[PDB]
Ligand binder design. Structure first.
Ligand SMILES: [Mg+2]
Ligand SMILES: [Mg+2]
Ligand SMILES: [Mg+2]
Ligand SMILES: [Mg+2]
Ligand SMILES: [Mg+2]
Ligand SMILES: [Mg+2]
Ligand SMILES: [Mg+2]
Ligand SMILES: [Mg+2]
Ligand SMILES: [Mg+2]
Ligand SMILES: [Mg+2]
Ligand SMILES: [Mg+2]
Ligand SMILES: [Mg+2]
Ligand SMILES: [Mg+2]
Ligand SMILES: [Mg+2]
Ligand SMILES: [Mg+2]
Ligand SMILES: [Mg+2]
Ligand SMILES: [Mg+2]
Ligand SMILES: [Mg+2]
Ligand SMILES: [Mg+2]
Ligand SMILES: [Mg+2]
Ligand SMILES: [Mg+2]
Ligand SMILES: [Mg+2]
Ligand SMILES: [Mg+2]
Ligand SMILES: [Mg+2]
Ligand SMILES: [Mg+2]
Ligand SMILES: [Mg+2]
Ligand SMILES: [Mg+2]
Ligand SMILES: [Mg+2]
Ligand SMILES: [Mg+2]
Ligand SMILES: [Mg+2]
Ligand SMILES: [Mg+2]
Ligand SMILES: [Mg+2]
Ligand SMILES: [Mg+2]
Ligand SMILES: [Mg+2]
Ligand SMILES: [Mg+2]
Ligand SMILES: [Mg+2]
Ligand SMILES: [Mg+2]
Ligand SMILES: [Mg+2]
Ligand SMILES: [Mg+2]
Ligand SMILES: [Mg+2]
Ligand SMILES: [Mg+2]
Ligand SMILES: [Mg+2]
Ligand SMILES: [Mg+2]
Lengths: 150, 117, 27, 48, 142, 110, 56, 103
RNA sequence: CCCGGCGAGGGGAGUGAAAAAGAACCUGAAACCGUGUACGUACAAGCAGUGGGAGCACGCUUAGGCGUGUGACUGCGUACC
RNA sequence: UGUAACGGGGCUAAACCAUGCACCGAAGCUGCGGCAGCGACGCUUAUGCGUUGUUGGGUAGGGGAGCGUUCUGUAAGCCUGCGAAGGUGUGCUGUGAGGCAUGCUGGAGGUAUCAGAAGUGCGAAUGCUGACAUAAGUAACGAUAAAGCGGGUGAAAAGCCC
């Protein structure tokens, strides 16, 4: 705290309480007693625990019928209108679309829709796999997920 | 973070200050005094739930002793008569009959006298 | 002078080193 | 299986002590420290 | 139900005349305080004055046993610092004999506003006569 | 028909004014004005000027005859206290309080 | 020379029980000008017991 | 006419057509109970005193309602010993209405 | 527009959705101080309450009697850390 | 300091000794109802379902289970100008921390559930800051060099001007 390290009054003689510092955390505009620091909240997860969790929740999306597998999912031109038409034809609103390839027109046509997210097969995460209502996998992305996850 | 605790401490003080209605002075206005006074009222209420059963039994006994000596027998003779006649009437009901139905109390006295004779 | 007014408590206890009206020091 | 349906295992998360937050918590005014020792003092304790 | 309580408006009180010639002082006084309290009534109530008005006559001819007639001492204090006073039984009888009965009953009555109200019903007279014939008092034999 | 007049920030103590205000509660206004005329307090000058303002407001703004009027409510509230520092001996300072008031006079027929 | 407990507002009101003002009982009326004045005092216009004792 | 009977460990003076708050019974809210152990029946200078109980007497009552009583607060407080408790309590009861005193 | 000292301040009128948004201006708690109403209180002694409890006032009500406020009198009872 | 060496009144028993029958008398015991803990036993346990005993004063202290607050996800969801939060009342409810509903004010945000992280709960520290009491409408109004009157001005003059 910006201040001075001088006693605001003497130790004794006055009728007031003992005090040693104006920066005291019991004063107005004093310090915080346990002031925080920039700390890292990252946890370690073991690799076999991360894969056990992904293999668990992909089994649960199968058992809950929240997983859709198609051969191909392409958009001709990078238009969100085309993507919304295709997802309306698929009867999908809240969806994660994981594709084993890099589709730029699909990334651009899905970038503005908050209901829709598009991932690479490497970039899948459990919290997205839960936060989205349906998950659409390319069959190649299935082959890659099965290969990473043994 | 930084929980600001004005709402909680206000409702916590008003829960006590509602219980302290009727008290004199700062005992009904000031939390430091009221909380100190509500606790004493809970202590007294716990105590006097026990003392109620003493004070009414004492009142009932004094009313039975009056109506029995009005009919010419003491309390201690009269309870011993009702024990020897096996009459298991409790002394709330005996004080009520001694007040409202003095004839039935007289009949109870004569049962107790006949149980001693 | 709201400065002097804000800070008055600091010094109304100005000298406060005086007392000892107990010549019989209690020794 | 949503983010508002997960719950941890039993006995996994334990609550943790919070000293000096009332009589009912158990860890009352002194917080497991007794009275007027060296051990009750802030930073107190002897070396190994 | 709830236990009956007497009510001060609906309570009835009666008048009794007791002759105090030759009777023992304290054994008289506890029966007087019993009937001023109302402990002879089935509708007795502690916070209610249910006792009876009592006229006590021949108060100067009350009897005590032993040598207490010459040895019982009534101390009191005037408030002032030397103000302890002292009177014997036969001095209180010669000077103001009603106080003897009044003090004995005041000591046997409850302490408080109700005990003072019970004491207001006690009406003692040194002689053998009273002005309260208008209240049709009965002869109480103790 | 009630008519209100207020002198907010009356430079006077509320305790000093309530002595005057208690004299005329429930009175006819001709009697209250004579009491305030021959009362020697400063608060009588204040509360008289307020009662005159309440009368003139009742006559102008509300259409009321003065002879039937009667002071039904009058009360003095504590105002904001401007505060000064008065120096004392041995370097000690004392903070005097300079009380204010809010005079309120409600006058009506009923 | 100072208190040990804060005295109540009840005692404060009981101390102020005698601090009430006595209003003037009745104003005397001049017989000539018909205006009201204090008994045994002159009027505001300068009358007292009828006559005009001083112009103004 | 009144009568005296035991219920819930305690006794009750009661006439016909009375509503009596008893301690909680295991009876539904509309059925009819019968208190056989009657202690005294008075019928206007026609008393009968149960030496151990009245033989032929029985009280037929209808259960009106069950319920819980008024909340009471239990406060324990040991001064200067850093101890207090709070505890509420509501006691179950059962209001009945006397259908008739079969003497 | 009115009272007032060509004041302060206020009452109207008017604006505005709102002036209990009027510049001492969002919401405006508490301590504290007041006005009014109900009850109690001037023969009465103490941690000021609690248990009981008359009476009074007010509401409800099918009169059933319950509430609410007060609390004469009375048993017990010497604050907290 | 005052009776002041029965608690008092008072007592010649209302004292003492012996015996006896009564009765009062505690939060003790018993009765009725309700909660919980730990053990039994059995179920066919869903790891709790009957019965069953027994236990339940408690500081330091150890163990176990919870409430509520702010924030993040769930939540571009739900509630909300047909009135949010907040404030003030009332009624109901739970074993408790508490909860729900609603009247008035207020006039725009709040947030279930299940998880997560805490600047997470205050009556005390001669605690810090602000506001308001108290004493109290009391002390005092600062050299005991001294004032009085007329007139003026002015809303108003002991204090200003002449
Ligand atoms: Mg230095
Ligand atoms: Mg600052
Ligand atoms: Mg800071
Ligand atoms: Mg790694
Ligand atoms: Mg209040
Ligand atoms: Mg310590
Ligand atoms: Mg030690
Ligand atoms: Mg130690
Ligand atoms: Mg006593
Ligand atoms: Mg100086
Ligand atoms: Mg002190
Ligand atoms: Mg005075
Ligand atoms: Mg103006
Ligand atoms: Mg706004
Ligand atoms: Mg405001
Ligand atoms: Mg307030
Ligand atoms: Mg009186
Ligand atoms: Mg006193
Ligand atoms: Mg009660
Ligand atoms: Mg002596
Ligand atoms: Mg008992
Ligand atoms: Mg027990
Ligand atoms: Mg049981
Ligand atoms: Mg036990
Ligand atoms: Mg325990
Ligand atoms: Mg402990
Ligand atoms: Mg959020
Ligand atoms: Mg609203
Ligand atoms: Mg918020
Ligand atoms: Mg609220
Ligand atoms: Mg609201
Ligand atoms: Mg904190
Ligand atoms: Mg505080
Ligand atoms: Mg503390
Ligand atoms: Mg402090
Ligand atoms: Mg003052
Ligand atoms: Mg003065
Ligand atoms: Mg003085
Ligand atoms: Mg003086
Ligand atoms: Mg002076
Ligand atoms: Mg001077
Ligand atoms: Mg002059
Ligand atoms: Mg001068």
């Amino acid at each position: 705290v910006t201040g001075s390290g001088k006693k605001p009054w003497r130790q004794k003689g006055t009728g007031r309480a003992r005090s040693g510092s104006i920066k005291s955390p019991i004063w107005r505009s004093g310090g915080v007693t346990f002031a925080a620091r920039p700390q890292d909240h990252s946890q370690k997860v073991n690799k076999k625990m991360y894969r056990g969790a992904l293999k668990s929740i992909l089994s649960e999306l199968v058992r809950q019928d929240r997983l859709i597998v198609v051969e191909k999912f392409s958009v001709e031109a990078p238009k969100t209108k085309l993507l919304a038409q295709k997802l309306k034809d698929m009867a999908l609103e809240d969806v994660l679309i994981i594709t084993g390839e890099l589709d730029e027109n699909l990334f651009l046509a899905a970038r503005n829709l908050h209901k829709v997210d598009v991932r690479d097969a490497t970039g899948i995460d459990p919290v997205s796999l839960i936060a989205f209502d349906k998950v659409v996998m390319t069959a190649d992305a299935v082959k890659q997920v099965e290969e990473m996850l043994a | 973070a930084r929980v600001k605790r004005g709402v909680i401490a206000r409702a916590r003080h008003k829960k006590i200050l509602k219980q302290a209605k009727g008290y004199y002075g700062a005992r009904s206005r000031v939390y430091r005094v009221a909380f100190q006074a509500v606790i004493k009222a809970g202590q007294y209420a716990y105590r006097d739930r026990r003392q109620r059963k003493r004070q009414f039994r004492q009142l009932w006994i004094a009313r039975i002793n009056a109506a029995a000596r009005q009919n010419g027998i003491s309390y201690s003779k009269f309870i011993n008569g009702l024990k020897k006649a096996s009459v298991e009437i409790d002394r709330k009901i005996l004080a009520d009959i001694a007040v409202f139905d003095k004839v039935a109390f007289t009949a109870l006295v004569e049962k107790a006298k006949a149980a001693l004779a | 002078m709201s400065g002097k007014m804000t800070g008055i408590v600091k010094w109304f206890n100005a000298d406060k080193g005086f007392g000892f009206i107990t010549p019989d020091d209690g020794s | 299986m949503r983010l508002n349906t997960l719950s941890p295992a039993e006995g996994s998360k334990k609550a943790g002590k919070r000293l000096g937050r009332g009589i009912g918590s158990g860890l009352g005014k002194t917080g497991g420290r007794g009275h007027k020792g060296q051990k009750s003092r802030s930073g107190g304790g002897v070396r190994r | 139900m709830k236990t009956f309580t007497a009510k001060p408006e609906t309570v009835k009180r009666d008048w009794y005349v007791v002759d105090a010639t030759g009777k023992t002082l304290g054994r008289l006084a506890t029966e007087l305080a019993r009937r001023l309290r109302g402990k002879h009534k089935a509708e007795y109530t502690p916070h209610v004055d249910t006792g009876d008005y009592i006229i006590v006559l021949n108060a100067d001819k009350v009897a005590v046993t032993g040598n207490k007639r010459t040895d019982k001492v009534y101390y009191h204090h005037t408030g002032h610092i030397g103000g302890i006073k002292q009177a014997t039984f036969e001095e209180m009888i010669a000077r103001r004999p009603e106080r003897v009965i009044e003090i004995a009953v005041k000591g046997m009555l409850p302490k408080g506003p109700l005990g003072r109200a019970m004491f207001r019903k006690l009406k003692v007279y040194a002689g053998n006569e009273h002005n309260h014939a208008a209240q049709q008092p009965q002869v109480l034999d103790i | 028909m009630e008519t209100i007049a207020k002198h907010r920030h009356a430079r006077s103590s509320a305790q000093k004014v309530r002595l005057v205000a208690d004299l005329i509660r429930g009175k006819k206004v001709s009697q209250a004005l004579d009491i305030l005329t021959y009362t020697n307090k400063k608060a009588a000058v204040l509360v008289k000027k307020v009662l005159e303002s309440a009368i003139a407001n009742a006559e102008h703004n509300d259409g009321a005859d003065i002879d039937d009027l009667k002071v039904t409510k009058i009360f003095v509230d504590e105002g904001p206290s401007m505060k000064r520092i008065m120096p004392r001996a041995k370097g000690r300072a004392d903070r005097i309080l300079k009380r204010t008031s809010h005079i309120t006079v409600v006058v009506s027929d009923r | 020379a100072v208190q040990q407990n804060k005295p109540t507002r009840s005692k404060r009101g009981m101390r102020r029980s005698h601090d009430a003002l006595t209003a003037v009982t009745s104003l005397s009326v001049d017989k000539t000008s018909g205006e009201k004045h204090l008994r045994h005092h002159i009027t505001a216009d300068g009358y007292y017991r009828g006559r005009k004792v001083i112009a103004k | 006419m009144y009568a005296v009977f035991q219920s819930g460990g305690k006794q009750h003076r009661v006439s016909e057509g009375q509503t009596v708050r008893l301690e909680k019974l295991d009876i539904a809210t509309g059925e009819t109970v019968e208190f056989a152990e009657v202690l005294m029946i008075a019928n206007g200078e026609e008393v009968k005193i149960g030496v151990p109980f009245v033989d032929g007497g029985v009280i037929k009552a209808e259960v009106v309602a069950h319920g819980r009583g008024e909340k009471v607060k239990i406060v324990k407080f040991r001064r200067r010993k850093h101890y207090r408790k709070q505890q509420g309590h509501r006691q179950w009861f059962t209001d009945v209405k006397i259908t008739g005193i079969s003497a």
